């Protein structure tokens, strides 16, 4: 009753904070994917210079 | 006889005041239990923010 109804409202804002934290981390994934675009494209250019040496 | 019968009527209202004071304190216990519902639910939310830091 007393802590049961209090944990019903608390669980509602906790699951909206779980879904919106998964959205914020979904903006993190494409940013580190673009950092790996600089790593793979620049390091393939280093393969151009080393292979011609 | 004289203070003995006087203390019989006085003891009757004293034991009705003991039982009804135990009832009034039984309304006090669930009110401080709801204050501990704010302490444990709010302080578990503070555990959410501190654990993500």
């Amino acid at each position: 009753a007393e802590p049961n109804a209090a944990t019903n409202y608390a669980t509602e804002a906790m699951d909206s904070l779980k879904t919106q934290a998964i959205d914020l981390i979904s903006q993190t994934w494409p940013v580190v994917t673009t950092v790996v675009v600089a790593g793979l494209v620049i390091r393939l250019f280093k393969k151009f210079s080393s292979k011609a040496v």
Side-chain angles (χ1 to χ4, degrees), chain A:
Chain A
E2 299 161 274
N4 283 270
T7 304
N8 290 96
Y9 296 101
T11 304
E12 292 168 275
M14 284 168 187
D15 290 276
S16 295
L17 284 163
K18 192 192 172 184
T19 313
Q20 307 301 81
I22 308 156
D23 292 281
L24 314 175
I25 63 166
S26 295
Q27 291 82 58
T28 349
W29 305 302
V31 182
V32 176
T33 74
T34 59
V35 180
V36 186
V37 185
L40 293 167
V41 183
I42 294 153
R43 300 294 170 162
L44 293 169
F45 279 107
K46 293 292 182 79
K47 312 300 172 183
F48 280 74
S49 295
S50 296
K51 305 300 172 189
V53 171

